[PDB]
């Protein structure tokens, strides 16, 4: 299908919002990407945007008014004046308030909906927005870290001009959000891997697999502990293909979540960046328009790792294992490499656990017409 023009969306702002003290979610690990690719020359071969800050006008063709209203209102200056409101919203805990609230999701969402408006209009074969990909926000709800739901809003631009569009999401959480907003159609098939046994976001059940005229319009894999390369590798590209075969889109949407990797401080999957990527790789084959988004991601050295890796694959651009020297080179030690190595833990996913439910799967795949 040759090399792809790649188009890019990245504020210098995104990284100094702040959750707080503790918090896991660090948008300062974009920032990171950006410079490590930056650094490793793949300006070179993409063009860069800065996305615009979507509006409440935007945000509410999924949102409802009421919840986008607070989300522009609500600062830790005026908190207790909303604890109801707040409680409501699930803002407070898990989705703290802090400065800028609003324009983290507003630059967010930019940049899933730019990259989508870039691809509606034919300029690119590829839309890459790492501040994106914020599967768990529901439509009146913030959840899992996420308040505005990017993709879904994505999903609602690319279907302007798209019959079908295929969601995938191999973060290590289940995107219950983007399933969710899209449960009941065919105009939208949502395919999520995931770990699941006693695990956010709880939902994601193999059993799971959408309702009214899009029964079989939703696809779940849940996995277990410890998933490997080989594992992850032996299943996604056999269902990606019957995916592609039978359910025929013309966009594809990819939530890259990198809290799937190995050594992520949420995630217990044992995954390398170049496992992570092959899954880009097969998407990258079937020369759809792709538009690729970020998500989860607490091993923020992985996280840079993993996404300027795998903006390179977009590229299709070899780059040394050797780290160029970049604003956050002290991060990477004590090897400064580029690929990481699985760790020891045992992989509870069997080989034949994940032939049993890639058999499942394809078994309710048949009932496409
Ligand atoms: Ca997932
Ligand atoms: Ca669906
Ligand atoms: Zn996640």
Redesign the pocket.
Same mark, same amino acid.
């Given at each position: 299908g040759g090399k792809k023009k790649v188009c890019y969306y990245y504020d210098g702002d995104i990284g100094n919002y702040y959750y707080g003290q503790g918090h896991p979610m660090k948008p300062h690990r974009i920032r990171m990407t950006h410079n490590l690719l930056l650094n490793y020359g793949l300006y070179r071969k993409m063009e860069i945007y800065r996305p615009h800050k979507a509006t409440a006008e935007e945000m509410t063709k999924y949102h409802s008014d009421e919840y986008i209203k607070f989300l522009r209102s609500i600062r830790p200056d005026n908190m207790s004046e909303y604890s109801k409101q707040m409680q409501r919203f699930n803002v407070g805990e898990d989705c703290p308030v802090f400065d800028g609230l609003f324009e983290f999701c507003q630059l967010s969402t930019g940049g899933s909906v730019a990259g989508a408006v870039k691809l509606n209009r034919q300029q690119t074969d590829m839309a890459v927005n790492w501040a994106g990909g914020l599967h768990h926000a529901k439509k009146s709800e913030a959840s899992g870290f996420c308040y505005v739901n990017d993709i879904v809003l994505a999903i609602l631009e690319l279907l302007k001009y798209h019959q079908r569009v295929l969601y995938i999401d191999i973060d290590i959480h289940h995107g219950d959000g983007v399933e969710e907003a899209? !449960?009941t *159609?065919?105009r939208?098939? *949502?395919v999520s891997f995931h770990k699941y046994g006693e695990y956010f976001p709880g939902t994601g059940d193999l059993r799971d697999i $959408?309702a009214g005229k $899009?029964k079989y !319009?939703?696809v779940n894999f849940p996995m277990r502990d410890g998933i490997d390369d080989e594992s992850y590798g032996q299943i996604f590209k056999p269902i990606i293909s019957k995916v592609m075969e039978m359910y025929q889109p013309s966009a594809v949407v990819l939530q890259c979540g990198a809290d799937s990797l190995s050594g992520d401080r949420l995630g217990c999957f044992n995954l390398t960046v170049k496992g992570h990527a092959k899954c880009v790789e097969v998407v990258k084959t079937f020369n759809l328009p792709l538009l690729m988004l970020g998500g989860g991601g607490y091993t923020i050295r992985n996280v840079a790792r993993c996404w300027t890796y795998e903006t390179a694959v977009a590229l299709d651009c070899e780059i040394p294992n050797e780290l160029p020297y970049n604003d956050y080179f002290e991060y990477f030690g004590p090897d400064f490499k580029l690929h990481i190595s699985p760790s020891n833990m045992t992989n509870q996913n069997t080989p034949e656990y994940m032939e049993k439910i890639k058999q499942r799967l394809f078994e309710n795949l048949r009932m496409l017409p």
């Open positions: 899209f !449960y *159609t065919d939208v098939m *949502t $959408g $899009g !319009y939703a």
